[PDB]
Design a protein around this ligand. Sequence first.
Ligand code: SF4
Ligand code: SF4
Ligand code: SF4
Ligand code: SF4
Ligand code: FES
Ligand SMILES: [Mg+2]
Ligand SMILES: [Zn+2]
Lengths: 176, 97, 96, 115, 386, 29, 112, 230, 208, 48, 125
Amino acid sequence: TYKFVNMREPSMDMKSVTDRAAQTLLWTELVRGLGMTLSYLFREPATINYPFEKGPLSPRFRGEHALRRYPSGEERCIACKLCEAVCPAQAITIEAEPRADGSRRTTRYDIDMTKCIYCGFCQEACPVDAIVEGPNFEFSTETHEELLYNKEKLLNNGDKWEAEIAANIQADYLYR
Amino acid sequence: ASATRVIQLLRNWASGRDLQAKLQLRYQEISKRTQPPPKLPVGPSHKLSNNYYCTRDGRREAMPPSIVMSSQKTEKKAVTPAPPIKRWELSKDQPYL
Amino acid sequence: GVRTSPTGEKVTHTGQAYDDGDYRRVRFSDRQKEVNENFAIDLIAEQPVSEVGSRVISCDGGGGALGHPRVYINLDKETKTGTCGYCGLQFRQPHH
Amino acid sequence: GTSVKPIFSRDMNEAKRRVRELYRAWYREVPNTVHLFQLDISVKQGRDKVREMFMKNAHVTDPRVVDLLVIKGKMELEETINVWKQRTHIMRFFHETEAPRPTDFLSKFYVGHDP
Amino acid sequence: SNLTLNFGPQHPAAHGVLRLVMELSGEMVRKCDPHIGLLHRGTEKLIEYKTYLQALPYFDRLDYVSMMCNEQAYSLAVEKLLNIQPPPRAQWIRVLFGEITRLLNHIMAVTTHALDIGAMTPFFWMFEEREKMFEFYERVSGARMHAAYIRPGGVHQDLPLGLLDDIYEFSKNFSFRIDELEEMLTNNRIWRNRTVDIGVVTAEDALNYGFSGVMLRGSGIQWDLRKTQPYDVYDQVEFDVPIGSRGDCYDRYLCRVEEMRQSLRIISQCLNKMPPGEIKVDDAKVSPPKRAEMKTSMESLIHHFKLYTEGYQVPPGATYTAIEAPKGEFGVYLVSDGSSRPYRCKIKAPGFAHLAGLDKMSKGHMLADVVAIIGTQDIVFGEVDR
Amino acid sequence: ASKVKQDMPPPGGYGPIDYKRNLPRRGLS
Amino acid sequence: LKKTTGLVGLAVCETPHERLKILYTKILDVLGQIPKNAAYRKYTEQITNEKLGMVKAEPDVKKLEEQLQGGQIEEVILQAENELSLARKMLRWKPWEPLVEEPPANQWKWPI
Amino acid sequence: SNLIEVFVDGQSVMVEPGTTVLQACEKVGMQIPRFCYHERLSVAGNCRMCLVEIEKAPKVVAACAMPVMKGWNILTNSEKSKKAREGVMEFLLANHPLDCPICDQGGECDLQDQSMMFGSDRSRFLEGKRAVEDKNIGPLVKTIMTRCIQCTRCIRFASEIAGVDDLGTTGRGNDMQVGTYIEKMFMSELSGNIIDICPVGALTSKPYAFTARPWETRKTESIDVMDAVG
Amino acid sequence: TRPTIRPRNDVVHKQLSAFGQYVAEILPKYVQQVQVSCFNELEIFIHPDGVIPVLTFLRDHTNAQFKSLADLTAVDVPTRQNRFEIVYNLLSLRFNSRIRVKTYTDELTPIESSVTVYKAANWYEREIWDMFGVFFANHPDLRRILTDYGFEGHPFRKDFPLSGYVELRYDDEVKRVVAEPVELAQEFRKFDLNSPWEAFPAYRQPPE
Amino acid sequence: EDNKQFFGRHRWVIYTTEMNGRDTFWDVDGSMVPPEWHRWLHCMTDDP
Amino acid sequence: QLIAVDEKLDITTLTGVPEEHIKTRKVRIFVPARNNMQSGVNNTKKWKMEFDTRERWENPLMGWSSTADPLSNLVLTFSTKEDAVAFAEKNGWSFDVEERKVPKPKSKSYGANFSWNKRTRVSTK
Ligand code: SF4
Ligand code: SF4
Ligand code: SF4
Ligand code: SF4
Ligand code: FES
Ligand SMILES: [Mg+2]
Ligand SMILES: [Zn+2]
């Protein structure tokens, strides 16, 4: 089922022809466009006062990565390497060994944030909610090297953002 | 909208429309940023019996394509790849723009 | 459980520190070496061993579905405690 | 028999004639390329390089492969004449920023493992 | 001798990566030769080293103005190769977000086309609506454009509570923004002078040149893949197909505006007909189990582990699956060798053929006319170069 | 033991949504 | 009588019945030079004779369009022209002949 | 000669007397799922994963142990065979621990792979799982016996190949445990092979523990120089 | 086999099989094989010499009317003596149908260009020549379309490496962008994903 | 907070004039917001 | 009409491969051995072509593994050994071919577990 967009005909009575002539000579549709812009001029603008005001975001928003802990302070990550396997950009590099107490823990956990596509597949794949995409998005740098995160950087990010990260996870985890 | 009434009238006249009815900026009408928890039901395969996987395995019902007329190996009416497409009907809602 | 090297460089929890003759230390000049101060091994060492009255205990890391996969831990051995392979929490049957 | 379909040439003589046509076209074009792209090389350098590129494939004895090589050379010439290539593309033939790689056994032994 | 000109890549009307070698006589365009590949990233080869899930995000970045539509095309191809069916609620969500995506794309196309022509203001009015639409994307997936929301088997997550009401609130107001855009452009005599009888293409030439979508329907061809070859639940929604009569820029612009209105209609129907149920296929050898199941039951953990490390195997075979994307027919030729990684993935983009037709369409026109024709073809070079 | 809770349309459906063209005549002779 | 076909570049044909009769007659004349047992000849003659009889049986253009299932008699004329050109090309090509060669042993084997 | 004719899904196969159903199936390139069977160990027949239907035979047979009879038509992919495989896999996974992320076997685990290929995709086991204590058998073979599926492969290897009778089973029923019953080291010049034959992560390499996953490793086929055996 | 499994369409399967038999009967000189897949897609495998006569037929015959060329691509299969599979996907709007035409070639054998049949083929053939090295005879303007000027090799071949052979950087001594042999700070990590257990018994090959 | 403003202007922050070591009278940026007020300010929640 | 060439196939000048990566490479053509950790045999069906392993080193930043040979991840699959040999020959690569290893058929007897007078008698089940 379809419709035509440009298949109409103008009436040739003297009234319609004279109206068309008046439009041609007195520029009525141009005045209509001017009226539309004038109407927009007196409307309230949509600009927010950044950085004092921010755009709305969801609990599901994918931001800067972080490594999380159990409430006892133990790392959640147990070096299963599912995030490394699933990562579509090969942005994750993991090395692991038994710890001094025999625990399964990483010795290297690197994310190349200039390789990362911020898809969130790593946090979907993680079985223990160890690696997450946090809410932070304002982490621009002056050098390329600062965006090659090692494990200490990611643990610091987790320690710094856990209060927000836990609340967002509490908000979203019943959909996962 | 905090616009005064005379500016509102001027906006309506310039636009030719009732602008206050449909405001682009969004206020209190939008949904709250805090919501109750969901429950999210489960699918048809969440059963304790009569649920053997071999009866619901789509991947294993795929098979190699049917071979018609290998080269190695009357009446005969002509055929088309499908019946001819039926002509479209003009819209009852709005036939012409 | 942070600790310093003979060069003054902080040693991380992975035990990685640049040697005294390593040129790569130059990368920290006029800057700093990022080190996480909350060592997980020491933090889990401070948790007390839970006394439970069953031969098999269940652990999911707390928080239900917000924890780790639920595993079962045998506590028959009296010479050692039962440790969770995900969380590090320890369990034992009452003795003595 | 070998039942092979040609591309342009039936034997090696017509393929060699097409090679000579392409070589003449490149040789004529070189001075214009030097002028238009504002290169710091001489016309002799460019022609010597053209000769070198042609000599690289002197060992080919298959007329179809020769025809395809002539097709590729014609494509490169058309890219050059229309200034679709830039100066970087033209200068890529000279490898002016690659260090000279040793060829004798001893230097390769000193520098690494590659045979 | 004609004058030769580089139109782009660093040009406002060249879309960043298009270098057009133009032969001109004065400002008359004697010849157009588009040079592309300035955004060729080797997507089709990269996909050969990914699992199907790993390959999914590459489709977000082909036509970056219509993300979920690309996701849907790829998901439909993979689901056809897997011989599985997405659940009904997933199909309704897919159609709803596909129409939201069509709204986004048509806003971008119409307003950037107007900006090339010289009308800069409607871009600003409509990009706030695009912003609101972006929020719907981010609320459903956590990303404003590259959602990766639509996957083979259904969708990644269910809608958050309250999303449908906000989509309804936006949809009940978008028609007035369309009305304002049409008040600025549709009857303006300058706009008509810039668009009427520019880039006229015949129906036969459009078919032979591989055109699709509006580039067909502007020339009177009554064809729409949603009507003729429906997918998901498109055979359950009512809408009209806008049809042009002149095959020029003005009729194509009118068609796109009417397609926006019909998309609003479809979105209303989708909002009122959303059913309950699960949102991905209840087959853990294809779709991952829920996180609570993964942490409780052995089979769920095994299937999570395997689907996120190896990925599902796809039975061997090849399919060409096409959809009515906002820019025309978007297709995938997917060849599976039986393993968990695709053997070959050829991507068919409508803009490829449309831009190949640009020299034919520009015959007898000027420079500004060529700018208008580029705008009217609705070209994004992520899908052209892949 | 609570009821299934999902994002769904309100009973009786949503309010009607306008989509058609609206360009009033709005002029003299 | 009809104002426009609605398709850009397709003109309205006056006297479509005579044009169709001419085109179908020319197609049958060309097909008469193709071997009698060639499948192309018999199939195309069958469909062409069906269309020619249908054209001769209905003098109303709209009802002829409805019967022919061909979409707007001008496109029927265009399709007849395409079929005539194809018939000449087929007479040149002679594809009714036996397959030129058998592919290699595993040319089409998939997977691998 | 002395061969007899059997059928695999209707396809004729000539086999020598004493050929088992599993071997006849692999004559036509069909691999029957297995846990306890190993072609270099004695037949056990305890895992029951190889159960397969014989045409016109009411009861399925253990393909690893059953000699094939003349005229038998083995139905490797019938409904009976698939349902038997699903039931056995369900029984194997009922008490298995949710250890895959921390288990070194993950990614090269026959239990995982045969669950994905021949088992169902979900669980309906609603009880608690059994947990057993670990046995110390040396510094080479790490033992986590909650993952043990009681295949008896390690026992048969130790007895038959290594000539060491130190492994066995203690208890019975659900409480049956594989071990040594005393604190004893299984130190043999061939001990490490029990890591490879063990289908699950119950026996793993201690020096290798936690270091790598199977999919990231590159394989170089080479020769050993530690002795003159090559 | 209910909600999870994709439904079948016997009507379309039968119609496509009948039309494939029709095409094979009309053009025995070139048609080598006809197949209908279980998701209702028709494939016609032809000798290369028949690229033009077949396509033209499918475009111009009154009962075919495949007026649209949706896509034209190549597939590289190094184990085959004829390396490259050439695939044409055609759409008929009159009959609301799709068809696929397949042929083969090796590195040194030209394929006839189909620009006289479908103009849309032009760029597609260029892309094939760019990505696979297949030469199309009588192409109006055959040259690279996707790769950089002066680029050597055909990237979409299976034996072409993923990162190629050369990379680019700006050099200040010569004040220009230069190409040098590729060196990667991190090598792409090859993953071995295939399970050693067979997935689909319906596609098992004879054990030779 | 001012809920009478439209969504996006209904919440805002006045930054401190002195953070950890630096003078922020003129130099402010969004990274100065601590995580809890980051959640409130971006409307990921309705509760301060 | 055809042209009847009589020379062996050689496409090296057309592939765009650098000289060094033609004459200095050694490809191995082989059927990959079964991974000893699993009993599945589905990864031992096809022939593989791979290249010789070149140097990998440590990146001074991040300690990542760095390479300089572009063929370190190139593996081709072939149906037979002859197809792989032909492909290697037409590309000018020197090759080493290893013959396919098939496990020999074995005599399995369950009853032998309980022999009256043989050593095959088992002491446990
Ligand atoms: S977000 Fe995606 S690309 Fe980034 S590390 Fe996670 S999986 Fe890799
Ligand atoms: S972050 Fe999660 S997925 Fe990645 S290795 Fe650690 S536990 Fe595994
Ligand atoms: S043995 Fe296999 S199934 Fe069991 S935990 Fe280890 S990897 Fe998982
Ligand atoms: S440890 Fe391994 S080989 Fe030994 S009984 Fe358990 S599963 Fe079988
Ligand atoms: S393999 Fe036969 S019973 Fe275990
Ligand atoms: Mg083991
Ligand atoms: Zn725990």
